[PDB]
Design a protein around this ligand. Structure first.
Ligand SMILES: [Ca+2]
Length: 267
């Protein structure tokens, strides 16, 4: 129950703290937790979405840093450039002229956070977001496609599975065609239990792109499988929520649930 988990968040965290998350949950979080957010029903323009999306789509370390940067610079952006165009502001304070290289800059373990820490930050990552994560991650691109297609079985006739995304998957989980021809999946990944670290990956051809996810116990209707590329596989969302793999020098797990996870930025 979301209200319960976000009411748990209220007590754990502080009124000044931010929760970083997608805007669809902006209001619920502010209501249940009584904390600040980056976006919400009333504030989710492209320029807005970029920051939650980045710290949800990029690699853990990159997301850890943006979380801190975006929060600190948005807060400050309430006292010139810092108003309207917060990414430029932070680039100057890092003397980076090229948007793409600064952003790539963030993935490095050797990135200095000059700006002081002024408040706590939490990541909120609900299961149900998978169904929309494709749209979430799209906003971490300045506007080179990605792939995050979730699907449920329509039928299972023969040794194949008629996935809802027009895809036809083999029962050994090693190929699909989409009504055409075979293309080996990079690896196989099945989630026996999220709350628990119950999963396993089977390497099956390196030069292959798409990963395949089997959600043996999806409590989410319409999300039984996930087909994703190497990038989405890298995201903090997949790695941290689904695979429950995270750096304990970057994040603290303060709320574990079947339905959602909450991490405390430690930086
Ligand atoms: Ca403070």
């Amino acid at each position: 129950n979301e209200a319960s988990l976000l009411n748990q968040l209220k007590n754990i965290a502080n009124r000044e703290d931010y929760v970083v998350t997608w805007w669809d949950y902006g209001y619920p979080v502010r209501y249940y937790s009584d904390v600040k957010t980056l976006v919400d029903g009333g504030k989710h323009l492209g320029k807005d979405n970029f920051f939650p999306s980045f710290a949800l789509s990029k690699d853990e370390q990159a997301a850890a840093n943006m979380a801190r940067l975006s929060v600190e610079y948005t807060e400050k952006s309430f006292y010139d450039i810092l108003k309207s165009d917060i990414l430029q502001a932070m680039m100057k304070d890092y003397n980076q002229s090229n948007v793409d290289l600064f952003l790539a800059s963030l993935s490095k373990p050797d990135f200095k956070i000059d700006t002081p820490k002024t408040r706590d930050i939490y990541l909120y990552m609900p299961a149900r977001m998978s169904l929309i994560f494709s749209t979430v991650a799209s906003f971490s691109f300045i506007n080179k496609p990605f792939t995050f297609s979730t699907a449920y079985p329509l039928d299972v006739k023969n040794g194949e599975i008629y996935l809802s995304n027009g895809v036809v998957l083999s029962d050994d989980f090693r190929s699909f065609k989409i009504g055409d021809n075979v293309v080996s999946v990079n690896s196989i990944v099945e989630i026996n239990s999220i709350k628990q670290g119950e999963y396993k990956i089977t390497p099956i051809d390196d030069k292959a792109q798409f990963y395949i996810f089997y959600l043996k116990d999806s409590a989410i209707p319409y999300a039984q499988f996930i087909l994703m590329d190497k990038t989405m596989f890298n995201s903090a969302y997949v790695q941290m929520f689904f695979l429950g793999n995270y750096d304990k020098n970057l994040f603290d797990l303060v709320i574990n649930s079947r339905d959602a996870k909450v991490f405390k930025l430690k930086i």
